[PDB]
């Protein structure tokens, strides 16, 4: 239970605050209609930090797609056909929220990933083991079903017939 | 009514020992000498040995040795059937054995009968296959059993199988074997290689000629 916090601080300070961009990245998929295969677009939306590189954006797409049909092989990020250098920042390409980014796959390969980083990893090092969802998708407050409501069963000083003082000093 | 808190936890579900109160006080030095003298009294050990603290019975490696070192009760087999009984116990009566016998292995024991003492050894192997090993017999098992008892001249046990065969395990007994032992027929088989009715005391009456 050592969570590196032994007091009550109701406010959120600067090391947990991140500056994020809602980047949506398109994938070329194929759906079956009565005629045959039809090419459509599947969008994966991530929150990438502003100072991140394109390899980090690719890793964010890999860890936050949670779909077994999209990130199956080695893909490549591109804008208007021109491929992106994965060692460059998003600010060097001027990538904004309206920038259309595509993911071109090479299905002959097989993407072997190692998800050793948890999905909710911030600087405070507090992650859940049964997390199952990116922290931007989950709600802030919800009902706790795992715990149990417990009432006070140990009286301190008052036990009975007449409340003279109640032993409030104890 | 449980012994969970009266004896140590390694004696959980423990039944069938001689006295489980012995193995709670083994570590006392007067009982520690008594255990090591008992292992020398049982033999099979070249060095002084005590059984482990969390064991009541003998260990599996030690009881396997004493079962292999134990001399058989039948010494000096005269007949090849009695050598097959010693091969039966080394194979189908070893310590913690897994393999079961075969109905063809029972046919080998029923084909080596020479003296009437051999039928007592062979039919007790037939009882272990039905009761102990619980093996379904083959289709020709009563055929080998019938000709085994006729070598030793014992007909009263061969007709004993006909009045109740399903306790003995003979699920197939052909009608010519039933007519022979009950007295309807006077022969039980026809030889394919000699063309004569067995036994040979009836062949002198039935078949006066020899045919291929």
């Amino acid at each position: 239970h050592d969570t590196d916090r032994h007091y009550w601080r109701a406010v959120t300070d600067d090391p947990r605050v991140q500056h994020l961009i809602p980047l949506r990245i398109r994938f070329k998929i194929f759906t079956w209609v009565t005629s045959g295969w039809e090419q459509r677009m599947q969008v994966v939306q991530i929150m990438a930090p502003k100072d991140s590189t394109i390899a980090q954006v690719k890793d964010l797409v890999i860890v936050e797609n949670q779909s077994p049909y999209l990130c199956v092989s080695s893909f490549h990020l591109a804008i208007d056909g021109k491929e992106l250098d994965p060692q460059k920042t998003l600010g060097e390409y001027g990538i904004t929220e309206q920038s259309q980014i595509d993911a071109i796959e090479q299905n002959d390969h097989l993407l072997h990933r190692d998800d050793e980083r948890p999905r909710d990893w911030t600087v405070d090092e507090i992650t859940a083991e049964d997390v199952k969802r990116s922290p931007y998708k989950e709600m802030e407050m919800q009902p706790l079903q795992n715990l149990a409501p417990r009432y006070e069963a140990r009286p301190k000083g008052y036990f009975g017939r007449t409340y003279y003082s109640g032993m409030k000093q104890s | 009514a449980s012994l969970r808190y009266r004896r140590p936890y390694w004696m959980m579900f423990l039944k069938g020992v001689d006295n489980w109160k012995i193995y709670t006080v083994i570590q006392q030095p007067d009982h520690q000498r008594t255990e090591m003298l008992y292992q020398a009294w049982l033999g099979g050990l070249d060095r002084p040995y005590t059984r482990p603290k969390c064991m009541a019975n003998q260990p599996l490696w030690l009881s396997k040795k004493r079962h292999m070192l134990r001399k058989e009760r039948l010494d000096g087999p005269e007949t090849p059937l009695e050598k097959y009984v010693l091969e039966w116990h080394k194979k189908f009566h070893s310590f913690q054995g897994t393999e079961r016998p075969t109905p063809d292995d029972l046919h080998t024991a029923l084909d080596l009968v020479e003296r009437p003492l051999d039928l007592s050894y062979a039919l007790q192997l037939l009882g272990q296959c039905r009761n102990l090993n619980n093996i379904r017999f083959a289709k020709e098992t009563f055929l080998v059993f019938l000709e085994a008892c006729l070598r030793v001249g014992r007909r009263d046990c061969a007709e004993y199988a006909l009045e109740h065969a399903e306790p003995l395990g003979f699920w197939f007994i052909d009608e010519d074997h039933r007519r022979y032992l009950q007295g309807e027929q006077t022969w039980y088989k026809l030889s394919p290689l000699d063309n004569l009715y067995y036994p040979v005391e009836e062949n002198a009456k039935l078949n006066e000629g020899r045919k291929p």
């Binding site: - | 009984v85 009566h93 079961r100 102990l132 014992r154 003995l168």
Partner: protein, 226 residues
Amino acid sequence: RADPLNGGSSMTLGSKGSKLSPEPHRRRMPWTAAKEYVPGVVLNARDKMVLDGVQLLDIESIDRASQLDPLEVLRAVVATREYNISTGKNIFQLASQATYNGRGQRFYRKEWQEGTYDKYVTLSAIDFDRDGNKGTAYGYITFHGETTTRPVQVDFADVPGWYMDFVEERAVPFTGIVPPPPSIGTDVPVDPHSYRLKAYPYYDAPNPPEFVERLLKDRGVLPDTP
């Protein structure tokens, strides 16, 4: 808990039941899981009065002086077989006398077919040890038409009291695999003329009139008199 009797109700300790949950109440004792048990005292103790006047012989005693007459040996074998059958029929005693070790046949306990209880086990595999009356049996459990997906270990498979009826169509050889019998709701379509449910959830059997008469005579409502 996972499954309490009548919810949480604690006016008496008998209102909870003789066991508080089907799960084991402690983690260290998995043998305390709630399951259907079998009266092994009456069943495992066979009648020893069929061995009187019968000279049994030990396995190790293969000396020449201890051998018996072959008629006496044969009546000892008959008496030992009648001793092993005297209480009931085992699974391993019924399957050894069957084709393909009884694979695919339906074995059932005596009380598995009476009342509104309907349950059998379609046998899939039996691994005999050297003592052929024991071992371990496997099968698909069918309870009121519904069937398991995988073969389960048949509990109390060595205790006698089992029955089966041999059907040649259900026999599966050692080359093939025993197919699971179909669930009457899921796999095959439901037909009332083929299988009709004796019981269902939220159903209790009607009261027999002899039990009603017996309880009203015990409580004193009916004038029971000699």
